[PDB]
Design a protein around this ligand. Structure first.
Ligand code: YS1
Ligand code: YS1
Ligand code: MG
Ligand code: MG
Ligand code: MG
Ligand code: MG
Ligand code: MG
Ligand code: MG
Lengths: 343, 343
């Protein structure tokens, strides 16, 4: 497994990331205390996940750049850009946990729920984002791809925020939101909120790093990667309710938070009028008994088996897309990514 | 007054800003509802202030670029970059109002206090930020200064967030924070949180637009502009308590929120031990009677007269800096800016 193969060196590179983001302002001691807060923010929030998005940059880089051009400096730039993707994700999560009223993330209390943090986490989150562009400068400013990367990261953020906007608009708190929860709206949400940044962004970054900047090559990669992302989000929704928090590292809130989850969309497609009424009376509310009623409804409708069938069909569909659209890139680039998310 | 002279054309340019940020994705109808939310966010939050920061870009541009090079397209780029500064500020305020538990801004209820908005405003704020980089691309991508502007805006954000970090760290809720409130810490806070983005950013942007990109010219401009910014923030703190909310458009929270305000720093310098104790017992708490006690203390210590003296001395000091550091730029560039903030 090529992700495990590159993991340790990537993770160990974190000290260097923290060191260069702390040391770059030893020349300005009056900001010492801000810098220490940044360090604490990085350490709590950018560590502890599975690093698949950052690692994807690195594995993809190795597979796309000719080995004779993989000098020490270029690898360092690749582990740095990988970390920039993880930092983007850290910004997103910290803010999302606040907006979702989440309890835990990566096996510990959400950063904003820490005593003494609260809504200060808003600024903490944005600092994680600013770190991306300082690292791109410190490590990549003299590279021909520098601007492409800056623009990639900015556009990825914009798309992602557009997708968060739809996530929030589709799920107003304290309303009955069932008529809003359609398959078409679902696919739009997850394309924008998850697929661009989680799948297109890391591979695209590696592409530009390798000097593959053609529009057609990016469009083809995107066809594969945006569909993987849609599956990834469906799985995220499944696990919100049915996954083991011991393994997910986080407690699910989709039902309480009234979300257009893949589960509620599949529920609506199947429910009788009587089942619809049950979902209407119990969805999007904080009472444990009501959440439990929704979960029972889902189980009565065999939504776990439906997801398992969907996963098999999605995997086949993605693999067909790889056959179609991978060339001229190594298919291994897409296949390693698929092996990581299906299972 | 050159700011009034350029105001109407700048304000009217807002429709075009909103139109191009809405129209740039008529090709993607599935995001229609996100785009309408953006529009509502822009309209509530980027309108209604005095526009001094955005206008500064425009006035400075007119004064730095030879008139024969001020074609219609170049002016449009200048009004656009001005608006980008206002959009940065809109991002900052929306988030800051949440973190400060503010009530009103620009004569109306804070965006996050609107029923149905709440903490969704976190995402709204970040969308305002993303708009900056989409406008820089749509209007400036073919210009030699494009990268300079992107980097300027990113670095300005980072500095500003570093300054917000110190603002928050110096003012932990529910602690006695008086020992933390020194003049040295005060000057560091306001340099980073306010001066870079409010004064250096707009003029620097205009400079780069005019092809003035030399390090020495920027350092000299910065000496003037960072000190103006420090005065601007002191005045902001004075007005938090003593200004007319009818004119400021906003209710002050610095005392309740336990801030390292210029007022509390000057208080500590003057107070007897008995007065220190009064401030310790009443500062940083939500009770109206306690806030009122602090304000009386400030008045007993003639802090309004102290500020008026400070303002006169600061103005003289800034003007000396202009004599020193303005050349080779027109002094009018700095003087119009000063006329706007002193009075
Ligand atoms: O990890 P989860 O399950 O909490 C997912 N988290 C997540 C968050 C985001 C996200 C949230 C808020 C964001 O707001 C930007 C200003 C912060 C951006 C991205 C995008 C994709 N997935 P969710 O969609 O199920 O909430
Ligand atoms: O307009 P005010 O008086 O509320 C000022 N507002 C203000 C806000 C900021 C600010 C706040 C939060 C920010 O957080 C970034 C992630 C949002 C950034 C800038 C900077 C300078 N002045 P304050 O400093 O007195 O709160
Ligand atoms: Mg969430
Ligand atoms: Mg969410
Ligand atoms: Mg989820
Ligand atoms: Mg404030
Ligand atoms: Mg504040
Ligand atoms: Mg203030």
């Amino acid at each position: 497994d090529v992700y495990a193969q590159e993991k340790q060196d990537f993770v160990q590179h974190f000290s260097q990331i923290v060191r260069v983001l702390t040391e770059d302002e030893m020349g300005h001691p009056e900001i010492g205390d801000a810098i220490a807060r940044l360090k604490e923010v990085l350490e709590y929030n950018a560590i502890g996940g599975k690093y698949n998005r950052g690692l994807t940059v690195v594995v993809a880089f190795r597979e796309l750049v000719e080995p004779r051009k993989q000098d020490a400096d270029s690898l360092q730039r690749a582990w740095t850009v990988g970390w920039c993707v993880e930092l983007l994700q850290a910004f997103f999560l910290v803010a999302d946990d606040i907006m979702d009223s989440s309890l835990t993330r990566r096996g510990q209390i959400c950063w904003y729920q820490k005593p003494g943090v609260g809504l200060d986490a808003i600024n903490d989150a944005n600092l994680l984002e600013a770190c991306i562009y300082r690292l791109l400068k410190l490590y990549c400013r003299e590279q021909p791809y520098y601007l492409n990367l800056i623009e990639l990261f900015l556009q990825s953020s914009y798309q992602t925020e557009i997708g968060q906007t739809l996530d929030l608009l589709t799920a107003p708190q304290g309303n009955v939101d069932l008529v809003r929860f359609t398959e078409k709206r679902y696919k739009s949400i997850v394309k924008y909120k998850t697929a661009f940044y989680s799948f297109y962004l890391p591979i695209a970054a590696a592409m530009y790093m390798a000097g593959i900047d053609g529009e057609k090559e990016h469009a083809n990669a995107k066809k594969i990667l945006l569909e993987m992302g849609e599956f990834f989000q469906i799985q995220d929704d499944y696990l919100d309710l049915f996954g083991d928090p011991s393994v997910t590292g986080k407690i699910g809130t989709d039902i309480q938070d009234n979300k257009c989850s893949w589960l509620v969309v599949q529920c609506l497609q199947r429910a009788t009028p009587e089942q619809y009424q049950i979902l209407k009376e119990n969805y999007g509310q904080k009472e444990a008994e009501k959440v439990a009623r929704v979960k029972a409804l889902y189980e009565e409708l065999d939504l776990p088996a439906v997801f398992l069938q969907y996963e098999e069909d999605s995997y086949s569909h993605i693999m067909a897309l790889i056959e179609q659209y991978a060339a001229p890139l190594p298919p291994a680039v897409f296949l390693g990514l698929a092996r990581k998310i299906y299972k």
